[PDB]
Point group: C3
Chain length 114, copies 3
């Protein structure tokens, strides 16, 4: 797994430690090893949510398995929680798209996972 957050929150409001905290929490939540987790934060974006430019986020979580109805609900709680606490973004201004990737459709180290 890989997690991307795009946000209008400015770069200086992103705590040092944030990427490393995302990595560790995602390891716990997904059961995958932290050494294979990727995280990407994109601040200072030009975006609106409901026509307003108060803090908001558009995110994604890609995983080879560990995606489904109950799991995505816990991920959303965890992730919205982190975004609320660390970036001061309200949970109702965050979308997270979940993608269950086939191992054949993930490239890594000159090959794929299948």
């Amino acid at each position: 797994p890989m997690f991307i957050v795009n946000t209008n929150v400015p770069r200086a409001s992103v705590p040092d430690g944030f990427l490393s905290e995302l990595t560790q929490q995602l390891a716990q939540a997904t059961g995958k090893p932290p050494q294979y987790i990727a995280v990407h934060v994109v601040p200072d974006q030009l975006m609106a949510f409901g026509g307003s430019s108060e803090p908001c986020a558009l995110c994604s979580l890609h995983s080879i398995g560990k995606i489904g109805g109950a799991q995505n609900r816990s991920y959303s709680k965890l992730l919205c929680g982190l975004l609320a606490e660390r970036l001061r973004i309200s949970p109702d201004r965050v979308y997270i798209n979940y993608y269950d990737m086939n191992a054949a459709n993930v490239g890594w180290n000159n090959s794929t996972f299948a």
Copy 2:
């Protein structure tokens, strides 16, 4: 629904009001309430279309339903007409990837939509 555009056009060519205009036009086109529509514009990108770096765009529209053959063609006409009129990007240098998201694979407000 959420709409993202990445483009090589500079930020200063993005008119003021463009995010509001996208929000209102997508609200009408999708039928979804405006307060839930998210829009994201990413100018000044390093990109090329057909090997040429004249103005271009790579876009996404995600929605829980309201995605399909005829509807997608209609969204493309709407959206390419906005990009052409507002950012001066020729419609034949724009791609829009459409994603019909399962409600269970969209996180929002600490949970999902299923």
Copy 3:
């Protein structure tokens, strides 16, 4: 096709010619006409792979067909090799997500391809 690379490598490390080379090499690999191929490179990103901020990349390749077990392995070797050679990113710090798009879900030139 369309290929997007996101990376923490700095902008000044992306060689002139890189987008053309990607274009040409993707034409060769996918067999599609160069004029349809879109490429997009986003340097200087805040990102981590395995908790480390050594050079890394998160990529996508979208195509209408020409995605599959063996083809994806071949694309990963090609694109990781370019990333290693031109941006100095180790292949084991690159993820590439592959998307086989339905023609109906690709907008272009006021319409879609289905």
